[PDB]
Amino acid sequence: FACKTATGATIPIGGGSANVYVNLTPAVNVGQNLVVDLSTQIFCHNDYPETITDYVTLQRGSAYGGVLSSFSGTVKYNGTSYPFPTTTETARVIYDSRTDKPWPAVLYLTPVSTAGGVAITAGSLIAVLILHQTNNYNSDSFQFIWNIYANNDVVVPTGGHHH
Ligand SMILES: OC[C@H]1O[C@H](O)[C@@H](O)[C@@H](O)[C@@H]1O
């Protein structure tokens, strides 16, 4: 079992870490959800599907930068919504093919009530997600650590008399 990003960063058998750079909607209005769909950027495969079934969860997710300071939200993993930051492991997804399959993780993040102005800066680390892989074959338990960086600034528009 190993994983890669659409841009070509890889994490090999046994786990490791990689960086994922994401485009974000540049203005996230109050009450709205900024959606970070990692299933278009992170893909994984099973190296021995004839004999081994791989089980993959989101084990932990932490918030950073502007997301930590100015957003609240959830992570939708394989269709079920969990808190984000996430300290409790999710249900599992089965990987059973040598063909790359998306990792079905999507962040839904809404600005907190005191947000306003620049909330996320380009290049900043905004999230870390731990993909946990086990299987039905041996004792392997591996962590694939995805560092999620913003490709662009995100602003929460404000009102007032200054524009
Ligand atoms: O993907 C099938 C199998 O491949 C390798 O042996 C290791 O990555 C295992 O942990 C995994 O279960």
Numbering used by the authors: 1 to 163
Which lines from the publication concern this structure?
A comparison of the structures of UPEC and K. pneumoniae FimHLDs revealed that both FimHs bind d-mannose in a similar fashion with small differences in the orientation of Y48 and Y137, located on binding loops 2 and 3 respectively, which make up a “tyrosine gate” and are involved in binding of mannose ligands. These results suggest that the H132/S141 residues in K. pneumoniae FimHLD result in a less flexible binding loop 3 that reduces mannose-binding affinity.
FimH interdomain interactions result in a conformational equilibrium between low-affinity and high-affinity forms.
